[PDB]
Symmetry: C2
Subunit: 180 residues, 2 copies
């Protein structure tokens, strides 16, 4: 499984040093992936902070409710695979679609890029770069019952729930609440 990465060094040169979330221009991010993105074996990428794995991270909203899942997580993330597209930008956009459709049955109406998530507080977060989207649509079901439980919570309740969340979910909760 070869997956999409960028050199952390190139990421830092292009977007600067930040911890948490930062809004960026989507065109600029896609241009960045085409210029600096490459593919590596997941087994070598997982432990090597030389690179950051590019992770589309989609928060699903159905009306005024946001989907949260437990194995709580606010976003649905996955890797971008070499086979997902001819170029890093194409692979990214197709992985975004595939990634979400693996976990849930949803009819998306619009997907909005919000920005990037970069955090350094765990071994795993240090080897990941998140591309945060808000996916507005109709939620039908989760694809695998033995993998995930789900809840659809109102934004009024997200304030409460984000206290029991960690990492990217916590950051994404803060961003979503501030946006609305």
């Amino acid at each position: 499984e070869r997956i999409l990465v960028v050199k952390t060094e190139d990421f830092l040169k292009e977007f600067g040093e930040f911890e948490g979330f930062m809004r960026v221009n989507f065109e600029d991010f896609l241009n960045f992936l085409d210029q600096y993105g490459f593919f590596r074996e997941r087994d070598e990428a997982e432990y090597d902070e030389t690179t950051k794995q590019v992770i589309p991270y989609v928060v699903i909203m159905d009306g005024d409710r946001v989907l949260i899942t437990k194995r709580y997580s606010l976003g649905i993330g996955g890797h971008v695979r070499e086979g997902d597209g001819a170029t890093p930008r194409e692979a990214f956009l197709k992985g975004l679609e595939r990634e979400v459709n693996e976990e849930v049955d949803v009819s998306l109406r619009e997907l909005e890029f919000l920005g990037l998530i970069n955090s350094s507080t765990t071994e795993v977060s240090r080897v990941h770069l998140g591309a945060l989207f808000l996916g507005r649509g109709k939620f039908f079901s989760v694809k695998e019952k033995d993998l995930f439980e789900w809840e659809l919570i109102k934004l009024e309740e997200l304030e409460k729930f984000s206290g029991v969340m960690e990492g990217w979910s916590k950051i994404s909760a803060a961003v979503l609440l501030n946006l609305f």
Copy 2:
């Protein structure tokens, strides 16, 4: 007490939208203060998200140890305060003296470099949403806290800071993450 503030619209225009910490150039920031900074009554800024109160926020390191303080009482990392109108003739001048004053009111230290690291902008609390943090690392000799009946302190090794960051909140937690990544 009239204190240094900026309009949120001016802040977002200059620095954009972020949640957490972002590195910025110190000169650019000070220029930003001179261009957009002004002073307003403190009590009347607490209830207003139209403006952000500029808070110098200094993490102190003595050798390879970092200062943690504690007045539920969380451990905290960083000493902050408001910049007062009487600290200087301009926003930049008031900031720089207020930065020094702010720290000296809380602790007895002798600091080499104040290294400006960047800005903290978090929206997770009422106080957070009206505060803009200017994060510095001050390296020096730490002697004591000014008010020993208001705070306890500990100097912890940097390899212990990850543990403490796990139980801290707010700007302390963010600042711990920034410092650990710098090292």
